[PDB]
């Protein structure tokens, strides 16, 4: 039994399984440009363990 930080490669894998349907948008506050190497939503769970029913909220 682990729980590493939803981050990196381990995060895009987590969030396919965790939203489970095909069919969500996914679709973030963009902010102009979406990128700039920067994210926001990675640094939350990165520094600390994210809540499983924070992840289901993102994934509308």
Same mark, same amino acid.
């Given at each position: 039994f682990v729980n590493q930080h939803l981050c990196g490669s381990h995060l895009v894998e987590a969030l396919y399984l965790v939203c489970?349907? &095909? !069919? #969500? #948008? %996914? *679709? =973030? @506050? *963009?902010?102009? %440009? =979406? !990128?700039?190497? @920067? &994210? !926001?939503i990675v640094e939350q769970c990165c520094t600390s363990i994210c809540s499983l029913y924070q992840l289901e909220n993102y994934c509308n």
């Open positions: 489970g349907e &095909r !069919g #969500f #948008f %996914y *679709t =973030p @506050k *963009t902010r102009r %440009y =979406p !990128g700039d190497v @920067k &994210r !926001g």
